[PDB]
Design a protein around this ligand. Sequence first.
Ligand SMILES: *C([C])([C])=[C]C(=O)[C][C]C(=O)N1[C][C]N([C]C2=[C]C3=C(S2)C(N2[C][C]O[C][C]2)=NC(C2=C4[C]=N[N]C4=[C][C]=[C]2)=N3)[C][C]1
Length: 886
Amino acid sequence: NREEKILNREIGFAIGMPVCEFDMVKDPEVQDFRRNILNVCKEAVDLRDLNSPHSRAMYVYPPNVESSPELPKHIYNKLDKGQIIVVIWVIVSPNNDKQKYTLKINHDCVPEQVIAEAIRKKTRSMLEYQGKYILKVCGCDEYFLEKYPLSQYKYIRSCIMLGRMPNLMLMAKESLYSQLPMDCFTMPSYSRKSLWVINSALRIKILCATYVNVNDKIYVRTGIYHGGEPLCDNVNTQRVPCSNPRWNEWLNYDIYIPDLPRAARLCLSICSHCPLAWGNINLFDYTDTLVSGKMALNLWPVPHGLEDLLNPIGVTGSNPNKETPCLELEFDWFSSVVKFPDMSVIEEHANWSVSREAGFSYSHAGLSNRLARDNELRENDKEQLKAISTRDPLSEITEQEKDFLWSHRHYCVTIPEILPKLLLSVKWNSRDEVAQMYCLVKDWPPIKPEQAMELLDCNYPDPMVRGFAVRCLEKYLTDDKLSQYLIQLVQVLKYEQYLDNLLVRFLLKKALTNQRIGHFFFWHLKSEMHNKTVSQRFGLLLESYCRACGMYLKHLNRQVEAMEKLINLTDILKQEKKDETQKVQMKFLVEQMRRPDFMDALQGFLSPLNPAHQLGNLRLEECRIMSSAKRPLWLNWENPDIMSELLFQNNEIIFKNGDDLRQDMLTLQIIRIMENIWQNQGLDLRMLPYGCLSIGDCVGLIEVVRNSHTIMQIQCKGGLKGALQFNSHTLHQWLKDKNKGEIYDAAIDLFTRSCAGYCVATFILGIGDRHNSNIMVKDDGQLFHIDFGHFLDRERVPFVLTQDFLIVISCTKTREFERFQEMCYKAYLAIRQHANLFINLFSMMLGSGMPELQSFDDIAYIRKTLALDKTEQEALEYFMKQMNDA
Ligand SMILES: *C([C])([C])=[C]C(=O)[C][C]C(=O)N1[C][C]N([C]C2=[C]C3=C(S2)C(N2[C][C]O[C][C]2)=NC(C2=C4[C]=N[N]C4=[C][C]=[C]2)=N3)[C][C]1
């Protein structure tokens, strides 16, 4: 009906594919997903409409807050006896005259209390109307709707740290609520055995192949896997000529069918040894059914630099493009459909196995190193389990250590954080052990979200394990932290066996409960729709999101359309007008930007970098085509916020169409985390994790930091014509000229602190080497880095402290450089202590096709730079040596 067909066009524009493509998919799982996911949409809508309009205002404008109200000791010191000075603005006339009221208030004040005192100062002039008012940040669309202490709001904490005066606007409730239009979720047209009693070894037939188009013989190599680990020995068909690709071969593996775990996967590949193509298949379907009968798999091309003939970290499922090597399989058949057993059966088997081992005599337990001896665990080996739990995720557990953990599996519950080590020590090809592990996991106590995230990576495919990890996230993950780790959580969806799972339901709920979260959820999902390995999953999830997010769908289509214009325009530059002058390129740009359909599409929408930023009219006089060969556009928009002068009058963003910005995006995430760690640990090393967002196949947006210049910019602008640019003091003089008088010390102080941070950060992450063009400096002396090209690959210092920077700290033999060295040393230690977090963050990211991050071996570089297997004092000594080598 009318509204449904219009809604489909909108959704089709949002994603990039029409909805009716999903209607044509004749696959029970896809159609079930579309239908069954709608319960989450329904729940999310009902939560929003629960306590209107305030319930719906907090969905659209959620409070951007820190996870804790506790201020680190140095942050509290900046207050005047624990009190912050805030300025409160009121638009009083229809003429829009601004009146400011400055307050000195407690840092932990509730917004309502801050509004009360603002009215007290306003009423003083005259010598009523209580809580009909809300606070807004001047210059952007962020509100303080919730009853948090004022300091806990990020903006106000930033203003404390940076020393800035926070400028808030007082605003009437019904003005905001009026703007929130009544969205209307509607339901779409599409919305409406045997068990372990099988005594046999697993066979799989391989019938033939087609589309094996090529220039020795060929053969199919197969293997049965659980995650990265082979459940048994791999098995191969015979070498037969490529002219007649027909085998007809029942291959017998070394697995009892009853032992096949839930996430068991067949991994196959056609090989000439060189693997020509590959494919993986779940042996169980989404309904717990062991898959039987004839089946056809369209294979994928091999990725570059894949050593083994199989690809078990590879994504499961048939290729969308059916003009690729196709392989016809056939599985076994029995007297009925075979289903994986219920938890009740699994518990009965597990409880049976537990009491049987309770009765094992000394000698019986002698026969296997995996059998627990009850009441014979001493304090020495209890400490060994703690030491094993306190190691990194890339540390190899030996087969003796595995037997050992598993022997003491019941004691491991008293040290919950050991769980990922205990799960890797399980033999996932024993139903006896797996059933006990399920039971241990069922009652396993809650571990921190940071630690839980590891169990969603590619090492832990089992749904009972993943369900627990998701369950921890639901309990302990704040929306702040969800936003922070959102990109990793989006990636690990690729590792899920089925479209309908506990993780995707968790993320979608939050995306639909919190528009900040939904924004980036949409863009992260939309940027990989080119990647046919994930297009159907992400496409269907985007369909469900767009169908249920409300009016924000209209605002996303603005942004999508805006990016389509920029992608269209820059494609014309780097293809049609490839090597013309800057004048002729700029002329062409202006003429095409000024066309009516272009001109409306590129103004009056929300910044995809930060949707609280309204992008008004273009300042085309400030827009330019940049010197980088890929031709990134520098774009300047007006900020149409009434009090834009207070935050920033102009919002300017670099749009780039050509290069992969996913690496830069990951490095900037990490820099922010590292900084949070330091700021919580009490040392103020101010970093600068500016906005960076990938929106497609090598298309993306970069925030411009206002009042910033590269080192060469400082050297040239400060360098006489004819002369050479090599003058090292020129940087120090520039900072001296910008920061005259008593301000000078603060500039040098912020310069050292920021430099010590980017020294430590770049060394650890192994960033691409630093030019004078790569390093930047704000006018107040804040140093930071821009083009983070690659990471993770004797080990390199990327940021070699040349004289220029060292003279600004002072030059080597001084009290100023010693204190700076002590900043770097203490900084490096803090990240070592949190090594597991960063190791886990990178590990969740292997599903992304980032070239510098394909195998776990890539992540190992962090184990070398952080020096984990060494001691802490010897690790500080390692760092000292790598820097003095220079
Ligand atoms: C003398 C030789 C005469 C001086 C000159 O005339 C040469 C000037 C010069 O070479 N410049 C280098 C390029 N810049 C323009 C900029 C390029 C980039 C900028 S600014 C930024 N910024 C974003 C952050 O805010 C500040 C600026 N970023 C990037 C960029 C980024 C950022 N993240 N990832 C990423 C990848 C690629 C590029 N480029 C003029 C001076």
